[PDB]
Amino acid sequence: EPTCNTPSNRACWSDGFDINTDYEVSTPDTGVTQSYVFNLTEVDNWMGPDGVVKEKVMLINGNIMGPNIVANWGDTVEVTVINNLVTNGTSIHWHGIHQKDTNLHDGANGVTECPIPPKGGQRTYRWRARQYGTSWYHSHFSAQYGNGVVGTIQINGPASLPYDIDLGVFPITDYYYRAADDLVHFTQNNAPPFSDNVLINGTAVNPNTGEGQYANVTLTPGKRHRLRILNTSTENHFQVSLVNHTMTVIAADMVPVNAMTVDSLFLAVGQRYDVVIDASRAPDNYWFNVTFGGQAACGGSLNPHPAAIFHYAGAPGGLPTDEGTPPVDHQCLDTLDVRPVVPRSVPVNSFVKRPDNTLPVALDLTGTPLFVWKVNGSDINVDWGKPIIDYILTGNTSYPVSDNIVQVDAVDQWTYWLIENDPEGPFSLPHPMHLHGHDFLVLGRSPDVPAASQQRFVFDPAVDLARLNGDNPPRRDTTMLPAGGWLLLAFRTDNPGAWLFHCHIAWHVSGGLSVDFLERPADLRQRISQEDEDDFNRVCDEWRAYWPTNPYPKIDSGL
């Protein structure tokens, strides 16, 4: 609950809590709990926002997206998920939420829990809002979120720039007429398709029929508006821009950054940007454009011009008349110019490439299916019926190869990870790398070159050590692994648990592109509460009893 957060002073929140407070170690004791109930239903022949009827969707509370989770910094968010799907299990992951000492609430099936069984199965997630900003939630049951088990999270807190109006969430996502499981099967043997449409705040116009509506945002003239842009896609990576307006970035993912004014922004899958838009221009209707760069290396749409309308209050209605100029090609790369308000400093001169800190991503075309993504020689494949947490609770350390366990025993120390993007492979694609449970520091990446150029880079200490930044580098939960290159990340081992580190392109994580950071396993067992242990076991017993009756097999990694 705020006491000093005003339009002119957004830096202030409450006594002892402001924009400069280290949120990772200090949290407000509000004593408030915001509760929600997620009823997942399976709807056939559902009328979508662009007029096209989809074969099957999986919705939360009968809507395209679940409810917008709204709470204050320090509150506890509680969500009861009731799975009323016909066959599918489910697990809701709270993307961007660190789950500090609450690993069993991460929603990663086959890792932190067993899937919640269908036909009425339930589980109540409970997590502390130790970070303020814009995040999202989604199913981690294969590519199930591609069917509609998605939604947004807005944890209110201070900001790095004053603003008058909080316009709230603005989720932008790719939209396919085909269901997630059919698309997983397709992408296993074929190149990923372009999206049928791109929804902005749950709506879009059909490029063929003209049906549906554009997202309409009403701007109040002369005011500063906070817009929370999210990319909730399964594959599409977006470039966003507003005609005749600049966007001032105040947050990258769920991390507050110093004000950074730009003309356009690149949002990888899972990325978020809180921007401040000043309604400083002439009263008119302006196009908010969703474009693609990187020469289709990180997505495209069958809708050539996905857009939303930004209407100034008091101005006339109708469609905007200025098409604008195309934004700069971001080349499937997010900006490394963002600088977090609360700083972090790490040495980069001491980094040495070793097998134990290197994660080689590779596309294996030799097996069945054709598109199998391997990290350090193995495509991830979890056991929905026997999660990593079960191994921890039973004292079993014989983790199967397919779980891609990367055990990190270091206590509260900075660990360095070099991710290589199939340098010696036939072709390489950009990958939006996401980490559960932590925000990582983006120390550096291979030279920014055209995404479709097929130019390869292997980490060379002689020229690359000088290119790394350890003086308050970008801190976030998702960043781009350049096509054919490399990426150097670092995260402090302050959160014992089993944490997935994967590409957020649904087709790739389904295909096996992931590792599981088993962080401080010895400390994790001590921190698991009896309530969390009993409930984990309850859901697992219910899932294991359900599984043999399921008429469909597990066709992918399960993530």
Ligand SMILES: *[C@@H]1O[C@H](CO)[C@@H](O[C@@H]2O[C@H](CO)[C@@H](O[C@@H]3O[C@H](CO[C@H]4O[C@H](CO)[C@@H](O)[C@H](O)[C@@H]4O)[C@@H](O)[C@H](O[C@H]4O[C@H](CO)[C@@H](O)[C@H](O)[C@@H]4O)[C@@H]3O)[C@H](O)[C@H]2NC(C)=O)[C@H](O)[C@H]1NC(C)=O
């Ligand atoms: C979670 O819940 C979802 C929703 O029900 C399940 O998704 C279904 O999964 C099944 C099994 O994988 C899919 O069935 C298979 O579909 C293949 C493709 O068919 C689609 O595409 C073609 C071409 O566009 C269309 O003509 C067709 O109408 C479909 O849209 C078929 O090739 C498969 O056939 C073969 O296998 C079956 C099963 O063994 C045999 O009966 C056949 O004879 C043949 O050998 C098969 O039918 C289904 O398409 C998926 N539906 C959706 C909506 O995605 C998930 O499986 C479930 N997940 C779990 C783990 O429970």
Ligand SMILES: *[C@@H]1O[C@H](CO)[C@@H](O[C@@H]2O[C@H](CO)[C@@H](O[C@@H]3O[C@H](CO)[C@@H](O)[C@H](O)[C@@H]3O)[C@H](O)[C@H]2NC(C)=O)[C@H](O)[C@H]1NC(C)=O
């Ligand atoms: C996007 O949403 C805004 C806000 O709801 C819409 O703005 C509204 O536009 C209508 C016209 O379509 C305005 O109506 C007024 O009607 C009278 C009588 O016909 C006319 O004399 C006025 O000039 C005006 O057109 C209304 O005032 C306006 N509301 C605000 C607060 O600005 C906008 O139309 C929507 N855009 C789309 C494409 O849906």
Ligand SMILES: *[C@@H]1O[C@H](CO)[C@@H](O[C@@H]2O[C@H](CO)[C@@H](O[C@@H]3O[C@H](CO)[C@@H](O)[C@H](O)[C@@H]3O)[C@H](O)[C@H]2NC(C)=O)[C@H](O)[C@H]1NC(C)=O
């Ligand atoms: C931002 O989004 C808007 C809205 O989707 C885009 O406007 C669209 O612009 C295209 C051209 O770039 C228009 O299509 C063209 O129409 C002419 C007809 O004269 C035709 O000859 C061309 O072959 C092409 O089809 C389209 O009509 C227009 N949409 C609307 C409703 O105005 C805009 O281009 C986007 N801007 C950027 C920078 O991406």
Ligand SMILES: *[C@@H]1O[C@H](CO)[C@@H](O[C@@H]2O[C@H](CO)[C@@H](O)[C@H](O)[C@H]2NC(C)=O)[C@H](O)[C@H]1NC(C)=O
């Ligand atoms: C990737 O797999 C390789 C095995 O091919 C791992 O390399 C071994 O790592 C251990 C340390 O745990 C060393 O004692 C061995 O000497 C290494 N063998 C090799 C290949 O030289 C490596 O740890 C794995 N990388 C990660 C981060 O998972």
Ligand SMILES: *[C@@H]1O[C@H](CO)[C@@H](O)[C@H](O)[C@H]1NC(C)=O
């Ligand atoms: C979930 O929603 C469906 C459809 O509205 C309804 O039939 C069912 O009773 C609901 N289940 C629960 C437990 O909320």
Ligand SMILES: *[C@@H]1O[C@H](CO)[C@@H](O)[C@H](O)[C@H]1NC(C)=O
């Ligand atoms: C997004 O859509 C919701 C529901 O239609 C609406 O209430 C909200 O104002 C929209 N957000 C913006 C910024 O237009």
Ligand SMILES: *[C@@H]1O[C@H](CO)[C@@H](O)[C@H](O)[C@H]1NC(C)=O
């Ligand atoms: C330990 O885990 C392995 C892999 O799942 C399993 O084969 C073995 O039976 C387990 N040991 C026991 C009985 O706890």
Ligand SMILES: *[C@H]1O[C@H](CO)[C@@H](O)[C@H](O)[C@H]1NC(C)=O
């Ligand atoms: C954008 O729109 C304004 C409308 O007031 C137009 O006059 C202006 O020329 C446009 N901006 C530029 C310079 O492209």
Ligand SMILES: [Cl-]
């Ligand atoms: Cl996360």
Ligand SMILES: [Cu+2]
């Ligand atoms: Cu996610």
Ligand SMILES: [Cu+2]
């Ligand atoms: Cu996540």
Ligand SMILES: [Cu+2]
């Ligand atoms: Cu990928």
Ligand SMILES: [Cu+2]
């Ligand atoms: Cu994940």
